[PDB]
């Protein structure tokens, strides 16, 4: 019993964190086999950030301009290349702690664990979701650039995010491990603002199924809804549209609890209309959207209370 | 910017998790040097049950390797299994007993394999609001101070309300609980006042100031009000501990207490603080300073 915002154990990722220094800038890098991956803005000064020409800044660098530190050991850089917004530093030592891994690009709504780091040293781990507006509501200070997001389903680490910047509203933007940004963002100091964010509907429904599994039904009602009527109501509360893919994905949780997806949708419509009236759902007075259907199945019991 | 329920990096603890099996029961153990620590209920009159067991009755698995048990002893509610192999991954560590209101990270494990990490607090009623299923027994709670892991909790049981109970690593339970199937219930819980105040300071550091007001209060008047809402009493030690956050934000502790009083008496009025519509009490003053400063391990 219980339901917590649970992160994956971070040990496999901790063994990959290194410090990358280029001139006066110091940030984090991810050391996998003989390559260190880090944000390409490590080669920039603060002046450079308005309109940086990364190709021009990089051509002026040699391998020995990049200092890479792994624990108390200095790694030797023997090659460098840029792939989109990521710099790849070839080093002369393969990481003996390299776990089984993959680079995966995630979609809005997907969750992942973040290992926040400073100076190549891990400080904390938390769980978060890729928002519909492609930002993440992280907890990051200056020096956290290069910190990574990941999932560890089975024994394989799937790296999905690398931290690049904080937007004016305090939210965060970054790339996949191939250097492609999530969202319409650029690694440039320009007028960039997060688009209006929305609630991840399929995740709120998954979390309502989690509450039913753990023994709570106060929010259910005798009604059902069509998918279209639910979406017309949901969009008035800034909720993301629910698609047939989302309905199909909630199938297993629907069969485990005996509550049809459109019946759970009707309960969500009523909660949006009434609020909680002094009650909580899984210890929260707000509707939680940072647990996916997959997270609920992983954390919750297979037997409903 | 941002404020998350952040756990310590779990790698140093992951390298200590093992599976302990005794007959039909399988649970988790903590392997430090040549000893495996686990709940004694893996085997009631525990001395009588233990005397009937030999070393080979305990099966200890570390990854894909079977460890050989060469000795066994009981310390309070923890069983200590002496193994032939010292854990090469043993970190620098201490066993520490924590107090209600203090927080820690939990590495939830099943079959000696870590599945997740989350942050939680020892409630005033000595239970923890964890997330555990059958097989989680032996999972541990810890903090990291510099490069040293301070083990503070070992999971033993779930109570009827869905909350959890366990011991320190010396086998002493937190709370009036016993390790057996009998009628046990968590006492009425209270809110950790010093932690709510620390979280209000974290919200101010992050730009959330709508709840600040021009008023102050005496410590006695605040405690009379706090007692009415099932909040733990605030002591002068708590006021002293909040000193640094008070100097950083410019808001006196009793000034923040007057904000907390108004929130208790009137509610949030449709507003949120750090994305929450409830007053959060599972961040200590030290957790706030660490997360708003970047301390690494
Ligand atoms: C150097 S500048 O032109 O003033 N702007 C910095 C900058 C521009 C464009 C990019 Cl892609 C990256 C940066 C650096 C950057 O945003 N760092 C940070 C990352 N995460 C959290 C932070 C919290 C507080 C301060 C900085 C933080
Ligand atoms: C095993 S028994 O003696 O029959 N009764 C249970 C019991 C009594 C006394 C003790 Cl010290 C331990 C137990 C077992 C126990 O509480 N396990 C669990 C721990 N955490 C989460 C759980 C979720 C679902 C089921 C069990 C869970
Ligand atoms: Cl995805």
Q: Per-residue DSSP letters for A96-123?
A: TT--EEEE----TT-EEEEEEEETTEEE
Question: What stretches of B163-206 show up as alpha helix (H) in DSSP?
Answer: 193-205
Q: Is the dihedral of CA A89, A94, A97, A99 positive or negative?
A: positive
Q: Is B133 in the pocket of ligand 2 (CB under 6 A)?
A: yes
**Rounded distance between C-alpha atoms, residue B171 and residue B40, angstroms:** 9
CATH 2.20.25.240 fits domain B15-91: no
Question: What stretches of chain A show up as alpha helix (H) in DSSP?
Answer: 11-14, 54-59, 201-213, 227-234, 244-249, 251-257, 261-274, 293-299
A165: part of which helix (H) or strand (E)? strand A156-166
- From the CA of B260, how many Å to the nearest CA of chain A? 18
**Rounded distance between C-alpha atoms, residue A22 and residue A105, angstroms:** 28
User: In a mutational test of the pocket of ligand 1, which residue from A26, A39, A49, A128 has the highest number of ligand atoms less than 8 Å from its CB?
Assistant: A49
Instruction: Say if residues B230 and B125 touch (Cβ distance below 8 Å).
Output: no
CATH match for A15-99 among 3.90.1150.10, 3.20.20.70, 2.60.40.4070, 2.40.10.10: 2.40.10.10
How big is chain A, counted in residues?
305
Provide the Cα torsion B130, A216, B226, B276; round to 10°. 80
Q: Which residues pair with B21 in a beta bridge?
A: B26, B59
Nearest to A10 among B117, B291, B296 (CB): B117
User: In a mutational test of the pocket of ligand 2, which residue from B157, B164, B175 has the highest number of ligand atoms less than 8 Å from its CB?
Assistant: B157
Q: By CA distance, what is B272's nearest residue in A?
A: A286
Q: Which residues pair with B236 in a beta bridge?
A: none
- Indicate which technique resolved this structure: X-ray
Q: How far is the CA of A94 from the centre of ligand 3 (A)?
A: 29
User: In a mutational test of the pocket of ligand 2, which residue from B78, B106, B156, B167 has the highest number of ligand atoms less than 8 Å from its CB?
Assistant: B156
DSSP states along B217-280:
--HHHHHHHHHHTTBPPPPHHHHHHTHHHHHHHT--HHHHHHHHHHHHHH--TT--BTTBSS--
**Rounded distance between C-alpha atoms, residue A12 and residue A102, angstroms:** 13
Which of A16, A123, A136 would best serve as a mutation to test chain B binding (most B beta carbons within 10 A)?
A123
What are the backbone angles phi and psi of residue B39, rounded to the nearest 5°?
A: -60, 135
CATH 2.40.10.10 fits domain B1-14+92-189: yes
**Rounded distance between C-alpha atoms, residue B171 and residue B161, angstroms:** 23
- Angle, to 10 degrees, between the axis of helix A201-213 and the axis of helix A261-274? 100
125-144 in B: which are within 8 Å (CB) of A? 129-133
Instruction: Say if residues A125 and A151 touch (Cβ distance below 8 Å).
Output: no
Fold of A1-14+100-197: Thrombin, subunit H (2.40.10)
Other beta carbons within 10 angstroms of residue A92's beta carbon come to 11
239-268 in A: which are within 8 Å (CB) of B? none
**Rounded distance between C-alpha atoms, residue A66 and residue A23, angstroms:** 8
Q: Is A164 in the pocket of ligand 1 (CB under 6 A)?
A: yes
Helix (H, G, I), strand (E, B) or coil at A58: helix
Instruction: Say if residues A68 and A19 touch (Cβ distance below 8 Å).
Output: yes
Instruction: Say if residues B288 and B245 touch (Cβ distance below 8 Å).
Output: yes
**Rounded distance between C-alpha atoms, residue A295 and residue A135, angstroms:** 20
CB-based contacts of A75, cutoff 8 Å, min separation 6: A18, A31, A36, A68, A69, A91, A92, A93
Show me where chain B is broken: residue before each gap, C-N > 2.5 A.
Answer: 43
How big is chain B, counted in residues?
297
On the 0-12 / 13-18 / 19+ scale of CB atoms within 10 A, A265 is: buried
- Which of B9, B73, B10, B64 has the alpha carbon at shortest distance from B36? B73
- Which of B166, B189, B167 has the alpha carbon at shortest distance from B281? B189
- CATH fold match for the domains B1-14+92-189 and B190-293: no
Q: Does B49 touch chain A (CB under 8 A)?
A: no
On the 0-12 / 13-18 / 19+ scale of CB atoms within 10 A, A81 is: exposed
Q: What is the CATH number of domain A198-301?
A: 1.10.1840.10
The architecture CATH gives domain B190-293: Orthogonal Bundle (1.10)
**Strand-pair category, A25-32 with A77-83:** unpaired
Other beta carbons within 10 angstroms of residue B258's beta carbon come to 20
Measured between beta carbons, the chain A residues lying within 8 angstroms of B9 are: 10-11, 14, 115, 122-125
CB-based contacts of A19, cutoff 8 Å, min separation 6: A26, A27, A28, A29, A68, A69, A70, A119, A120, A121
Ligand 1, atom 11: closest residue by C-alpha? A187
Question: What stretches of chain B show up as alpha helix (H) in DSSP?
Answer: 11-14, 46-51, 193-205, 219-228, 236-241, 243-249, 253-266, 285-291
Ligand 2, atom 1: closest residue by C-alpha? B181
CB-based contacts of B21, cutoff 8 Å, min separation 6: B42, B58, B59, B60, B61
| Active-site amino acid positions of A | 41, 145
Look at A119 and B296 and tell me if their CB atoms are within 8 Å: yes
B238 among known catalytic residues: no
Domain boundaries, given as residue ranges, for chain B: 1-14+92-189, 15-91, 190-293
Q: Is B158 in the pocket of ligand 2 (CB under 6 A)?
A: yes
**Rounded distance between C-alpha atoms, residue A268 and residue A221, angstroms:** 10
**Rounded distance between C-alpha atoms, residue B255 and residue B212, angstroms:** 8
CB-based contacts of A228, cutoff 8 Å, min separation 6: none
Buried (b) or exposed (e) across A11-22, using 16+ Cβ within 10 A?
Answer: bbbbbbbbbbbb
Look at A6 and B131 and tell me if their CB atoms are within 8 Å: yes
**Strand-pair category, A17-22 with A25-32:** antiparallel
Instruction: Say if residues B187 and B180 touch (Cβ distance below 8 Å).
Output: no
**CA atoms within 13 Å, Cβ hemisphere of A292:** 20
**CA atoms within 13 Å, Cβ hemisphere of A147:** 32
Q: Is B159 in the pocket of ligand 2 (CB under 6 A)?
A: no
Instruction: Say if residues B230 and B191 touch (Cβ distance below 8 Å).
Output: yes
Look at A123 and B294 and tell me if their CB atoms are within 8 Å: yes
Radius of gyration of chain B (CA): 21
- Which of B121, B150, B156, B118 has the alpha carbon at shortest distance from B136? B156
């Amino acid at each position: 019993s219980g339901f917590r915002k649970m992160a994956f154990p971070s040990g496999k990722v901790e063994g990959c964190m290194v410090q990358v220094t280029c001139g006066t800038t110091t940030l984090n890098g991810l050391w996998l086999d003989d390559v260190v991956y880090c944000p390409r803005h490590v080669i920039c000064t603060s002046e450079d950030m308005l309109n940086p020409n990364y190709e021009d800044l990089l051509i002026r660098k040699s391998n020995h301009n990049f200092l890479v530190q792994a624990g108390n050991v200095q790694l030797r850089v023997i090659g460098h290349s840029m792939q989109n917004c990521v710099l790849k530093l070839k080093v002369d030592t393969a990481n003996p702690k390299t776990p089984k891994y993959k680079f995966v690009r995630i979609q809005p709504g997907q969750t992942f664990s973040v290992l926040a780091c400073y100076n190549g040293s891990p400080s904390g781990v938390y769980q978060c979701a890729m928002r519909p507006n492609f930002t993440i509501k992280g907890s990051f200070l200056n020096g956290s650039c290069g910190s990574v997001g990941f999932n560890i389903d089975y024994d394989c680490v799937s790296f999905c995010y690398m931290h690049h910047m904080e937007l004016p509203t305090g939210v965060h933007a970054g790339t996949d491990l191939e250097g492609n940004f999530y969202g319409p963002f650029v690694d440039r100091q320009t007028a960039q603002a997060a688009g209006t964010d929305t609630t991840i509907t399929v995740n709120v429904l998954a979390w309502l199924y989690a509450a039913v599994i753990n023994g709570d039904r106060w929010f259910l009602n005798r009604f059902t809804t069509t998918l279209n009527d639910f979406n017309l109501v949901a969009m008035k509360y800034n909720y993301e549209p629910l698609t047939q893919d989302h309905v199909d994905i909630l199938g297993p949780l629907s069969a485990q609890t005996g509550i049809a997806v459109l019946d759970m949708c009707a309960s969500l419509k009523e909660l949006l209309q009434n609020g909680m009236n002094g009650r909580t759902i899984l210890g929260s007075a707000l509707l939680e959207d940072e647990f996916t259907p997959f997270d609920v199945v992983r954390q919750c019991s297979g037997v409903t209370f």
